[PDB]
Amino acid sequence: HMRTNKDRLVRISVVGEIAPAKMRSPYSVTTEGTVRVIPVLGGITYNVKVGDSAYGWAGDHVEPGVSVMARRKEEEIPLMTLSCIGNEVIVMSGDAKGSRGFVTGKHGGVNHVLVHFEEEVLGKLMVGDKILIKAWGQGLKLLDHPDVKVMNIDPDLFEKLGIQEKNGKIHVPVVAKIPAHMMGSGIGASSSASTDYDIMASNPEDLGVADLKLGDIVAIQDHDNSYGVGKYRKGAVSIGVVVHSACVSAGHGPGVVVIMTGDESKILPEEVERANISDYL
Amino acid sequence: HMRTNKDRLVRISVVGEIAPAKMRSPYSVTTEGTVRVIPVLGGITYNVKVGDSAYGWAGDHVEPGVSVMARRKEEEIPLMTLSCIGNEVIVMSGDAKGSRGFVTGKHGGVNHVLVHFEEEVLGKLMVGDKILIKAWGQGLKLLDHPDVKVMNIDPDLFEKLGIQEKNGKIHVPVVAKIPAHMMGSGIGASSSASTDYDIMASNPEDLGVADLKLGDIVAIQDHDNSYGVGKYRKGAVSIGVVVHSACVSAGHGPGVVVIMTGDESKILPEEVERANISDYL
Amino acid sequence: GHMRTNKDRLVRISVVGEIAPAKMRSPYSVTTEGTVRVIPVLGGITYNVKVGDSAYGWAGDHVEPGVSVMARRKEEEIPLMTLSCIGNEVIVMSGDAKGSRGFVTGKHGGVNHVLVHFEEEVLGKLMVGDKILIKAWGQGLKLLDHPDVKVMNIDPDLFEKLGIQEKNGKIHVPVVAKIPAHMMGSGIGASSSASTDYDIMASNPEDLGVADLKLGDIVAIQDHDNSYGVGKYRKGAVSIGVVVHSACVSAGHGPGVVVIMTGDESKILPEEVERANISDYL
Amino acid sequence: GHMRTNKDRLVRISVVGEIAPAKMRSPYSVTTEGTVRVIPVLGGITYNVKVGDSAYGWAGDHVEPGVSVMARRKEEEIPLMTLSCIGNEVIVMSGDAKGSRGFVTGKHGGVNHVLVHFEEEVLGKLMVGDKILIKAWGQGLKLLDHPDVKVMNIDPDLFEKLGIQEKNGKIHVPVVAKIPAHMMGSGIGASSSASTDYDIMASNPEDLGVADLKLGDIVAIQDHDNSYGVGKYRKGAVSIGVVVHSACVSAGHGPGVVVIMTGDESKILPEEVERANISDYL
Amino acid sequence: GHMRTNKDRLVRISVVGEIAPAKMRSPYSVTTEGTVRVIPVLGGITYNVKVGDSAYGWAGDHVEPGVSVMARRKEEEIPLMTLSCIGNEVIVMSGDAKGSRGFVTGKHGGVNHVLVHFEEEVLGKLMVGDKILIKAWGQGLKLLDHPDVKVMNIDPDLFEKLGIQEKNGKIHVPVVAKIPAHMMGSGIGASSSASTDYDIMASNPEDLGVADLKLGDIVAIQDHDNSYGVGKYRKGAVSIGVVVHSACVSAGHGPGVVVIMTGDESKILPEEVERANISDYL
Ligand SMILES: [Cl-]
Ligand SMILES: [Cl-]
Ligand SMILES: [Cl-]
Ligand SMILES: [Cl-]
Ligand SMILES: [Cl-]
Ligand SMILES: [Cl-]
Ligand SMILES: [Cl-]
Ligand SMILES: [Cl-]
Ligand SMILES: [Cl-]
Ligand SMILES: [Cl-]
Ligand SMILES: [Cl-]
Ligand SMILES: [Cl-]
Ligand SMILES: [Cl-]
Ligand SMILES: [Cl-]
């Protein structure tokens, strides 16, 4: 595997609490201009989890597993910025205390970090239980590929994604390559370190695949995400992880957290049948 | 049973706490313009339960069993929208921690979800104890009856109501058929998903029945509740569940949460002697 | 002449508010068919909808004719909404229209607005925030010969001009329409008919058997008693009211009615006529 | 003549705000190259940038032409941003320029400013905090013969002067540029195209195949439906918008566009011409 | 003539504040010697200390000459402090001196005040809380032939009058003193040199090898880079600034300096002269 500065990274406690189910209205507004009453984001979601399809749920912006929010507003930036996909998460109060899980993703706006625990643990969790995330990953650098930025990813998880260097190029398995024009909500966020942005496909076939799953690794064509999110640049490529379900409103759909960005000459995405972080929990 | 998208519905944690008895004034104003000092809504109500008469109590808007409110205002909409009659409820703090009950109803305005627990649990409960509702049911669809909307009901409970797809209609057992003109407070609420509305009958005999009980299934003639509450339309029909006691004030009476709505060419209410959710919970 | 009343014993009192902004809790209004529309809603100075115009046909929801008046603060809403009576004198007390006079045409519960008509030339001088004084007068009014007929929400001088006639112990009241109990929705169950309107939920006038319904029209509501709380169904009760705001797109809503009289059908006799509108008297 | 509309049914209503201060959440603006610049940003009376000027070339980020108008308080934001339409009459209601009249040029979401053009002589008299009245008019407009073509955010009188032509059932719209879906960024996903703009994320006009793009220019956005929410990619959809603020230094950002028409390419035919700017009619 | 700049592309924008009261967090000021004194501090209209006077010799601490201007609210502080440039035009917008014009002489971080000179007859009519309009112009200024020399915090018209001379690729700057890195104190570490001053922590002018140091003087700071954050030691860097407030009694504090130029010693050549004070050009 690739040379990194992993040993120089700071490992720090990032605190939050299990978020309630949130809804700003009973209605979700469709792209057809109709309204529907369906579940949305937040909470412990009992029957949707990393590995499941992002499509086909009667729900909007559904977050798999356990949604974690800040204790207060001032604690949001660090929660959303330092938490990396794959980081270890420990429940620190309530009946599941001491149980361990993994960060599967994060979602900007409401600012939730999303966590996979094993099935048995879910029944003992309660909204408000204290959550400790052992944040580790921001600051990571590929020592031999200085023009390839990495972010939002636990360095140990990073090594399990099947990425190979060959001839000063990085080969990255992905389930799908997403055109620039299919990206929507979240473009223009200040930092790709602290939010996801949306693939705005209503159906997976619109991306040319039979399914898109929570946890999938995808490529986003012609987007640089080095600082702010979603700069269109022909020849840019980003790699990301799918983190929340399909949405009903215009401009929204399955969220993606960027883990790698740079130029097509250095990053080579390779389509495979399966590339999903749940295989390496 | 009928074909539903049940396996596509999202099951999510909705939190609250046991609400105190609430009164904005010592007096309740009657429709005769007199004042009475009687108990009202909220709390743990020890001797009024789902299955009891909605009429004959020295009280106003009395909520059977345990009234559950939100931790805070922002959490009211999800509490009231996502909670469905029949959903499993777990006590998460205090002396009855671990005890399980069922949602019987919900009440808009104060925004309480109403919950039945076994008798032995009530004596251990305290105002402020934490409550978890495993919310499940909004989004439910009859796949062979697209113009019949269902809402506010746990899909397992729905299956037990004796509803049958017969002779090209959905037949629904109810204890009474309530004329449009007997509906009052709550008409015009933004969503039928997040509130009840009132049968404004002072006496069960005004509806042509000897009694109306908490938990009863009723039809409301000539009202559509597809989106907002209480649209008069000749030939619409709604089905609902009685959720709180009679009331003393003009335009108020036992509340009804809607569970089904559509046109009389598709829904046939069948008037029977007994149709009450407590028979299944 | 006119019905005997306790009008000299009524207290006349200063009720204060300010011109309300246009209000919207969402860009969208949700229709009874479950679709969304982006349209103007309530509050403000509404420049082109006034008492006398149709309640129907506007691309708007809950449109309030003329000038909407809100309380300075929450504690002041109950008296604003309770004491203000249709026909009461209103005076602008700050801004460029200072000194201009108008009349209360209605009031709308929920947001708690009192609605006011000024002459057209005043409107272009008004600004949201301008202080408003309502010389409130009417609540406590009684028909001394008809103790079982309650009146409310109406300036006693305007009440005398409505063409209401007492004849052989019965009160004849000109109305443009007789609305069945089942056509009433939002507002039923409000704590007091003295402090709110409630909605005729007809999408179209034709649903009420009339070709048009106007802002300012006097209507009967059949089988509703409004003596204390709003909208008690009672077979044989009748209420008389004034239309105060425009039609609505959402389920259970429609042109608002403020009740001015309520009692039994043996005593109140609505007579359906071609015209009955408060704009003719102010 | 002009396309048939429901314009006589539209409600015209007072929408209030105040001149916003210049706003900056940090001294620094972060570039797409990951460096920092200290430059002016949004809000205020901007004395030397106006509708008709280039959107590019300013040492500024998200610069708003003319006078930026904000809500008096949070609850008044939705109506300010939803009901205010490009072209609507604006009147200064306090301070030294009281009585001065201008026009809405645009609006900008997030900070929620409505953007207003006044004549140059006025600008020097304005002060942050001066009360502003927008005679809001236009949401709800419908093309009665083109029900699948949605119009929005535009004063009906201005709409009639834009050079739009109905010929053989198709609507021809002059535009200065046709922008591909993928050049659109910040704002995609906004809840309603009625209450915000969204960004053309081009660092240089040349990235759009044109030499300049001006504040007030009418543009086409290819393959975006904006009927309800903002920025739905759909092949064959077309949207027409007005450029309303300056270029930006950060990733995903750029001159903002307020949508004024959206529908299908079979009905809306954008025609690229040498000039199409609302400043010519204001 | 003048150095080539991007001045035509700079955004000029309304920056609002109000006249600050005199501020004291305690009756006492703590000296470097560990004793306390009761003396006037910052804020207010200071009637007898003005740009051009000595920064030393006052029985006071952190005294701000002329009129101190603060934000209306905290959200407004960053733009007040960032965009306001020394030399910018200032207009009084309420009170008895309404219409009077003055000039920004400086700005002081922490309390976050912008300091302003009006002519003497104006001061007597001013009141704490009077509204103030700063026509902010100058952030974003670039020297187009000297890309590694950064300028900031200065009105481009004032900049052109300071007697700076480009000669053979080098910038000669008249200064009254050259201050070594180690004499700079409070403020080092501030996030941006665009929004704050920092302190020459000399308790006496003689500690800098000069007989006096005046409010308004131009000085060089040796071996400090102020390109981004304040006060980076770097051997060979040079910064130029303006003295903006009086001497101070506490450890680490002293007359404040707003940086106006920063870069390398091979490009910026400070020339120590007898007089170099911005009061000569207002
Ligand atoms: Cl999961
Ligand atoms: Cl590289
Ligand atoms: Cl119960
Ligand atoms: Cl059907
Ligand atoms: Cl009926
Ligand atoms: Cl009117
Ligand atoms: Cl009587
Ligand atoms: Cl009826
Ligand atoms: Cl302008
Ligand atoms: Cl069409
Ligand atoms: Cl495209
Ligand atoms: Cl001075
Ligand atoms: Cl240089
Ligand atoms: Cl030194």
UniProtKB/TrEMBL annotation, chains C, D, E:
- Domain of life of the organism encoding this protein: Bacteria
**InterPro entries in the cross-refs:** DUF4438_C, DUF4438_N, TM_1086_sf, TM_1086_SG_dom
Q: Would you tell me the protein name for this molecule?
A: DUF4438 domain-containing protein
Q: Which residues form the DUF4438 domain?
A: 28-160, 161-282
